[PDB]
Every structure is written in C-alpha cells, then in structure tokens.
Design a protein around this ligand. Structure first.
Ligand code: HEM
Ligand code: HEM
Ligand code: HEM
Ligand code: HEM
Lengths: 141, 146, 146, 141
C-alpha cells in the first residue's frame, strides 16, 4: 500500500500544510462543488455560496480528519473506522465522489505548494488519498 | 461540453500564458509517474524506472510536446472536438489500443500541472471550465473506438 | 443516439413484448435489494427489511411501473432523450437529490431483468443496443444537474 | 465482505452452472466485447469474431478461475494470488473493466438460470464478483 517512502512524502508535504489545512480543506470542497456539481446532492442542507461559513467549517473537519489519518498512517482502517461508518452506512456516499474530492485536494495543494508538489510527492499524496478513500468506502453498497 | 461564453474566455485567456513545450513534458511525465500502468504504452521510451528517469527523459518531453500541440488545436475548435480529433481517435484505438480510460487520467494530471504552474490564478471556476474541456477532449478521442 | 436502424428495430420489437407490470416492479425491487444504498431514497415505502419485503412492497411495484412508463416514452423519442427527460432530470436533481451515479445502477439492473425474462431472445447484439439506451437515459436524466 | 449467506448462494448458483461454465464463460466475453468495445483494447491479438476458438478457449479459462474462487470463497487473496499479479502487474487492466465483465457475467447467468437468478442470489453474486474484482485489481497503479 503506502511505502516508507510514500509515508515520508505525505508526512512532509502535509507537514508544510500545517495551519492552512482547514482553509485548504474548504477550498477543495468549493472546487469540488464547482467542477463536479453532482456532489452537492449530498449537501442539500448546506449553504454552498462563496465564503459560506458551513463550507469553511466543513473544510476544517475534513482537514482535521486527514491530519489524523497522517498521524496514524500505519493504522488508517482503525483511526478512521468511525468516519468509515458515517460515510458508508449513514451518508451512503457513492465511491466515485471520493475520487472527485481527492482530485480537488491535489489541485489545491498543487496551487499552494509549488515547491513541494514534485512528481514523487504528487504520486505519494495520490496513493495516500486513494487509501483514505478506500477505508471510507470499504463498507459501502 | 456546456462551455459558456465566459468559460470559453476564461479557458482561452489562460491557455495564452502556457508554454506548451514545458507543460506537455510535465504533464506526460507526471502521468507516467503517478500512474505507472500507463508506461506499458511507452516501452520504447527507454528508462522510466524513477521520476528523474521519466521527467528528464528527452523522449517523454518530445512526446509531451506532440500531445499538448494536439490539445492546442482542440482549443481552437471547441465547437468541433469530435471532427478535430477523429483521426487521432482511430489511431489510439486501432493502432495503439489505448483504453480510453487513460485519457481521463491525462486530463486530470494536466489540470494539476496548470494549478501547479498558475497557483492562485488557477481559481475554482477556471478549474471548472478546464474540467469541461478535458472531459470533452477525452470524449472526442474516445469517439471512434469500435 | 448511436443507434443503428437495425439497433432501433432491435430494441423496439423486444419492448413490445414487455410486461411493464412485472419488469417495472422487478427492476426496482432488485435495485433496492442488490444495491441497498439506494433504499435511502424510498424510506416512505416502508418495510424494505428483506428481499421478500421489497419484492412484495406494492409501493415498490407501483413505482417500478411509473418508472418503466417513463422509459417507454424515451424509446418513443430516441432522437431527443434530453428534451424528453429534462423535467424529470430537474426533479431528480432539485427535489430528490439523487446522485446520477444511481441511474447507471438502475440501468444495469433492468438489463439483467430483461435477460431474466427473455432468455435466449436476449442476445449479445440485443444486449448491446439496450446498453446504449440505458446509458442514453442515464445521460439524459443527469443533464439538468447543477 | 461476504456473509455466510452470500457464500452459500454463490455456492448454489455456481453449482447449477455445472458443465456449462465454459459456455457461459465464453458468452460473457462475447457480450462484453459487443456491449463495451473499449474492453477489446486488451485483446488485440485475438480473433474476436462470433464464436472464435480463441474467445471460446478463453471463456473456459475465466470460468475455471471463477469455479476456483468459489471453492476458496474464504481464501480468495491466496487462491487468486497468481491471477492478481497477471492482471494488476503484467496486463495492467484498468479496474473499470472489471465492472463490465461482472455485469456481463450476471447478464448471462440471468438468461441461463432463470429459476435460480433470484434477487437474493443476484445480490450475492454481485458481491462475489465485486470481491473477485477487488482481489484481481489489488495491486494496480
Ligand atoms: C477524503 C475523503 C473524506 C474525508 C476525510 C471526509 C471527512 C468527513 C468528516 C471529518 C466529516 C464530519 C462528520 C463529523 O465528525 O461530524 C464528514 C461528513 C460528511 N461528509 Fe465526508 N469526508 C470525505 C469524503 C466525502 C465525500 C466524497 C462526500 C460527498 C461527495 C462527503 C460527504 C459528507 C457529508 C454529506 C457529510 C455530513 C454533512 C453534514 O455535516 O451535515 N464526504 N466527512
Ligand atoms: C489529450 C490526450 C491525448 C492526445 C491529444 C494525444 C495525442 C497524440 C499524438 C498527436 C500522437 C502522435 C500521432 C502519430 O504518431 O501519428 C500520439 C501518440 C501516442 N499516444 Fe497519444 N495522446 C493523448 C493521450 C494518450 C494517452 C493517455 C496514452 C496512453 C496512456 C496515449 C498513448 C499514445 C501512444 C502509445 C502513442 C505512440 C507514441 C510512439 O510510440 O511514438 N496517448 N498521441
Ligand atoms: C433512468 C432511471 C430513472 C427513471 C426513468 C426515473 C423516473 C422517475 C419517475 C417517472 C418518477 C415519478 C415521480 C413524479 O412523477 O412525481 C420518479 C420519482 C422518483 N425517483 Fe426516479 N427514475 C430513475 C432513477 C432513479 C433512481 C436510480 C433513484 C434513486 C436511487 C430515483 C429516485 C426517485 C425517487 C426517490 C422518486 C420519488 C418517489 C416517491 O415519490 O416516493 N430515481 N423517478
Ligand atoms: C472476473 C474477472 C476475471 C477473471 C476471473 C479473469 C481470469 C483470467 C484468466 C483465468 C486468465 C488466463 C491466464 C492464463 O492463461 O493463465 C486471464 C487472462 C487475461 N485476462 Fe482476465 N480475468 C478477469 C477479468 C479481466 C478483464 C475485465 C479483462 C480486460 C478487460 C481481462 C483481460 C485479460 C487478458 C487480456 C488476459 C490475457 C489473454 C491471453 O493472452 O490469453 N481479464 N484472465
């Protein structure tokens, strides 16, 4: 899955994110909503306007969730169990949306880490996000 | 491909700033690195064992250029992508046997490279417009598969 | 559509022998059963507990007819499915919030139902034509999403 | 994630397939090729013409692999190890393609086992095939 090399990459790059994670999370969601509008069917109860506080607030939650997976990179399945259930059993979010959000995270980082966003970090981050997605949808159908 | 006047403009303004030699090498290069399965198509390109082997490979940069050039034509005929790409489409199907799924990959990677190059300039909406185009180009290249 | 006169002939002649009451109820039932996720949209139907609860649910079976009913129209206007499904598209989007991804699911479940019911008559070629139709419908339903 | 009940349905459905596994094997390919022509990109060296020996011979191999996964419904990762390397590393078949054969495997069974193709059995075979796809696309990058 995630190689030692991959983990360093992720650790390092998310390392650079630091204090902006929350704001990068919100931006990522916004990009998501704009580039792939089908994703909003999941958030009919949200205000999706530009600068929407719900989004900003939501972006933070996602951001935190990723920091926590980074922090428990060796035990994602258990570190994310809860979220796995919410998404697969309560929200019942189709797996494809996960690929859409990941794509949009990568864009955000890309736009934000010119220096760090090398091919190898890009590959790592991709793999990583693939991993989180996989955990979040294991129990779905 | 519901490309509105404004998206159309958006798209075109920015493509004006792109250095195709450059972005094309990056784009094809990052594709072979992020999604290694695609390297099965370029067994003639020599060494693709590591990111440096790939990114600095002169054959990848050369090819990367060809590709972005075709892309450029497409942007010049946003109203006729199917016609514009009919022959490339038969090639990739008939001669190369490329699963068209790969076109989606290149399209996404290509968007990361734009974001990477343009930073702040690569805004959500601009991103929105470009996702339509790449989707459109991928559909256009997929159209003559049989 | 990418439907050939001989393909249209194909789809047409088969549908003509379809028992809307049974196929309609079955395609929907099997959706709820094979893809339990989808049940989240038919909560008002009641007891979806088990395969048998589902297959016997009369809210289920009736709804399944409404649905095949709309399908039947699409087949009547294969040259304008978008035009034909615009309102229903708006509805699924603006009222129900159904991820268009589900259209695909339903589409595949119907093909299995037709094969179920027609056996030897549901040949590879015939299947091929219906794949294009369900895809077209899916596509048409997904069209007014924003 | 097969339940003991899925494992059972699978066992029964496939038990009825009997000596027809090959024929069904072959028919499903034929339908795939016809219904989803991009999947042909992976068999450029095959005679994909109606009732070709190649396709016929190939239908058998696939059918055997399935019989074999049924048998080891509990040790898939291990029984299919070899097939997993080939598909994910040697052939490097994109994952989406798996959902297209599965669909065609189900279509063929539906047409040939009307008595057995019950909703419950249907759901059970869907999960099985999804499972088989997962094992087979496991190490895909
Ligand atoms: C990287 C993948 C994802 C991560 C880390 C993630 C994380 C989270 C977190 C941390 C929450 C908050 C729940 C709580 O603790 O209160 C949440 C809720 C939610 N997520 Fe996700 N999520 C992911 C993917 C998705 C996708 C792809 C969708 C839909 C397209 C989605 C839709 C939702 C919804 C609808 C909620 C609840 C909304 C509400 O608060 O009313 N998530 N997610
Ligand atoms: C925007 C999408 C793409 C465009 C516009 C494009 C364009 C081109 C062009 C213009 C050529 C040269 C035509 C010729 O030699 O006659 C070419 C060749 C080729 N393309 Fe693409 N391509 C695209 C995506 C892809 C992808 C994603 C793959 C595989 C993953 C691929 C595989 C190939 C291969 C293997 C060749 C032949 C290279 C050689 O051996 O010389 N293409 N492409
Ligand atoms: C191409 C496939 C589909 C077609 C042609 C279709 C068609 C219809 C039709 C004709 C109605 C009638 C409602 C009215 O006239 O007010 C309807 C309602 C509805 N549709 Fe669909 N539909 C499709 C797929 C789906 C899917 C896959 C789902 C969810 C998984 C879904 C969710 C609903 C719901 C929840 C309703 C309202 C049920 C109620 O009133 O209790 N539809 N659809
Ligand atoms: C249920 C899923 C599948 C099963 C059980 C399966 C099984 C097999 C088996 C048993 C072989 C024979 C290899 C040998 O001779 O030892 C094989 C080869 C092969 N498979 Fe699959 N496969 C599956 C899915 C797919 C899909 C979806 C594709 C492509 C879209 C595919 C493409 C191939 C190709 C191209 C070969 C090599 C053909 C040859 O050179 O004879 N497989 N597979």
């Amino acid at each position: 899955v995630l190689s030692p090399a991959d983990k360093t990459n992720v650790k390092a790059a998310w390392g650079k994110v630091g204090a902006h994670a929350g704001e990068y999370g919100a931006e990522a969601l916004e990009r998501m909503f704009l580039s792939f509008p089908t994703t909003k069917t999941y958030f009919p109860h949200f205000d999706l306007s530009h600068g929407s506080a719900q989004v900003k607030g939501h972006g933070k939650k996602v951001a935190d969730a990723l920091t926590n997976a980074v922090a428990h990179v060796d035990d994602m399945p258990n570190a994310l169990s809860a979220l796995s259930d919410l998404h697969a059993h309560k929200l019942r979010v189709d797996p494809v949306n996960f690929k859409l959000l990941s794509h949009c995270l990568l864009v955000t980082l890309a736009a934000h880490l010119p220096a760090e966003f090398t091919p190898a970090v890009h590959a790592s981050l991709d793999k990583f996000l693939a991993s989180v997605s996989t955990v979040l949808t294991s129990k779905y159908r | 491909m519901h490309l509105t006047p404004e998206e159309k403009s958006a798209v075109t303004a920015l493509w004006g700033k792109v250095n195709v030699d450059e972005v094309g090498g990056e784009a094809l290069g990052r594709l072979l690195v992020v999604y290694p399965a695609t390297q099965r198509f370029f067994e003639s390109f020599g060494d693709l064992s590591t990111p440096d082997a790939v990114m600095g490979n002169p054959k990848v940069k050369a090819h990367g250029k060809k590709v972005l050039g075709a892309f450029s034509d497409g942007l010049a005929h946003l109203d006729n992508l199917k016609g514009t790409f009919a022959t490339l489409s038969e090639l990739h199907c008939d001669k190369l046997h490329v699963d068209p799924e790969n076109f989606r990959l290149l399209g996404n990677v290509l968007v990361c490279v734009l974001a990477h190059h343009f930073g702040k300039e690569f805004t959500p909406p601009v991103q929105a417009a470009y996702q339509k185009v790449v989707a459109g180009v991928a559909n256009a290249l997929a159209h003559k598969y049989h």
